[PDB]
Design a binder for this molecule. Structure first.
Ligand code: 2UG
Length: 529
């Protein structure tokens, strides 16, 4: 039997690779032989004409007898492609074997995946073991405060979405029903479950008041110094604003952190057009949590990229590879405003302007005599690792608008990227390089002939080989985002996944891919001359 060779190629395919008429009839011919292969069920379900009552009936029979698929593959079954109630329930049942830690990593996409669900089932669950996506998400949210906090904010922003409201009123109403269903489930739950609902309410009003505070500061006609004094004044008045002192509510940005209020004196506005605020949150244990509060911007694209960077960091750490990345938290509280976790760092542009180079900066704040080029071995290892991680991650996500004001550096050697306005190949200038690696980074690791540069390339291959192994999960997650109001996705929804897939070079073998990665680093470093 030599047919199993061509058959195994079809099974190993990416989730978004369309099966040809020939491949389709080959999978449908050998269905029963494939019931022992789990990664095959995925390929089997896309051969079925679900509009044919006889064909669907036999397929649902095979589903039952089939070796259950991994959580990662069940995500495909929740995309717009499947409408079969039984296939969608099967996906929920497989997603259920995953723990809350993995579930949270997928929550952003699953809230999107609700627009592919039965809208009538969602509405009818409202008061006048085999759950749908809505029922499952609420079920898990009632048992986990962290899960419930993100479910609240991810859904509220979709309700608030005015573009969805006018261009698709059916979808907007479904999300209001998802919110109503969640609120209903919380009020019907235990003593612990019912307090969760008032905590979400408290956070909502805190955000509402914080929004109002931002608008009140702009009433002050004066300069930034006068605007800052205005911000600090209003923040001190807890009778009026009620933001310096509040009952310990979870921080929307990181719900595991409970807060007492915002320190009024250390609160300032950033020198930028939209003037976002830098706010220090008093935690329950007397600590400080710096946040950026942005009003007049849609953080949903940055929220998606940072959620993917977080997943890629977790996947790499799981493979015993800590590339010292900065997956800072981003939570959108509206389509008009949101939070970002503040990381203490210096933009690479300010590094050059004040110290001349990265290596000078490193020598100033972290010197070591026997260390490479007079810099600490720990700081240098951190920098080489982070450069590598970000080089591969930005390449995969096709991050544009890379300039030295949105490349940040820490004194501990951590290098990270911010502001993901241009993603999936888009850039302000035409013909962008596929590898975003500038001369400043190369010079920081001691030039193209250093041992650090060789380690950097090595780390790049490792990271690229590890992330390619997780392409199925990443591509499934991006596939659930196709119809989301994410600017760089909404431009070409139908072409989005393919833009990510091509970066993996899944056509090449592990050895060929390392060759491609080493040449791509070569050609980009070459172009810098
Ligand atoms: N769009 C955007 N995306 C991310 C960040 C961000 C996120 C996390 N940490 C930091 N840190 C710094 C940044 C600039 N200078 C020092 C630290 N910045 C920022 C910078 C804030 C001025 C608005 N903007």
């Amino acid at each position: 039997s030599g047919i199993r060779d061509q058959l195994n190629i079809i099974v190993s395919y990416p989730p978004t690779k369309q099966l040809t008429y020939e491949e389709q009839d080959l999978v449908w011919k050998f269905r029963y032989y494939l019931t022992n292969q789990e990664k095959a069920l995925t390929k089997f379900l896309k051969c079925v004409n679900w509009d044919l009552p006889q064909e669907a009936k036999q397929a649902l029979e095979l589903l039952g007898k089939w070796k259950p698929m991994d959580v990662e593959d069940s995500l495909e079954l929740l995309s717009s492609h499947y409408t079969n109630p039984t296939v969608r329930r099967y996906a929920v049942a497989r997603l259920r074997q995953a723990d809350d830690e993995d579930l949270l990593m997928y929550l952003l996409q699953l809230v999107q995946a609700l627009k592919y669900e039965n809208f009538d089932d969602i509405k009818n669950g409202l008061e006048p073991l085999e759950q749908d996506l809505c029922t499952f998400l609420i079920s898990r949210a009632c048992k986990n405060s962290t899960l419930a906090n993100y479910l609240y904010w991810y859904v509220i922003v979709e309700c608030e979405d005015q573009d969805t409201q006018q261009r698709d009123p059916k979808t907007h109403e479904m999300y209001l029903n998802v919110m109503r269903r969640f609120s209903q489930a919380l009020l019907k739950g235990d003593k612990s479950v019912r307090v969760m609902r008032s905590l979400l309410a408290a956070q909502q009003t805190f955000v509402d008041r914080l929004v109002h505070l931002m608008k009140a500061v702009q009433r002050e006609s004066g300069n930034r110094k006068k605007k800052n004094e205005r911000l600090q004044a209003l923040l001190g008045d807890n009778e009026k604003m009620n933001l310096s002192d509040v009952e310990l509510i979870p921080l929307p940005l990181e719900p595991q952190v409970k807060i007492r209020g915002i320190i009024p004196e250390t609160a300032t506005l950033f020198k930028s057009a939209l003037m976002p605020a830098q706010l220090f949150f008093k935690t329950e244990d007397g600590g400080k949590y710096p946040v950026i509060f942005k009003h007049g911007d849609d953080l949903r694209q940055d929220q998606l990229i940072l959620q993917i960077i977080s997943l890629m960091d977790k996947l790499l750490r799981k493979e015993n590879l800590d590339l010292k990345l900065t997956p800072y938290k981003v939570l959108a509280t509206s389509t008009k405003h949101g939070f970002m976790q503040f990381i203490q760092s210096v933009p690479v542009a300010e590094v050059l302007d004040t110290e001349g180079s990265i290596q000078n900066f490193f020598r100033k704040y972290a010197p070591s005599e026997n260390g490479p080029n007079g810099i600490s071995a720990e700081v240098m290892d951190t920098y080489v690792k982070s450069c590598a991680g970000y080089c591969v991650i930005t390449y995969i996500l096709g991050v544009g608008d890379r300039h030295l004001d949105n490349l940040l550096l820490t004194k501990t050697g951590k290098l990270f990227h911010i502001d993901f306005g241009y993603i999936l190949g888009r850039d302000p200038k035409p013909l962008p390089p596929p590898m975003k690696l500038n001369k400043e980074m190369v010079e920081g690791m001691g030039g193209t002939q250093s041992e650090q540069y060789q380690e950097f390339r090595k780390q790049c291959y490792t990271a690229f080989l590890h992330l390619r192994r997780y392409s199925n999960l990443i591509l499934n997650l991006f596939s659930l985002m196709v119809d989301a109001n994410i600017p760089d996705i909404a431009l070409e929804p139908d072409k989005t996944v393919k833009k990510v897939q091509d970066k993996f070079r899944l056509d090449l073998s592990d050895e060929e891919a390392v060759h491609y990665m080493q040449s791509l680093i070569d050609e980009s470093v070459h172009a810098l001359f």
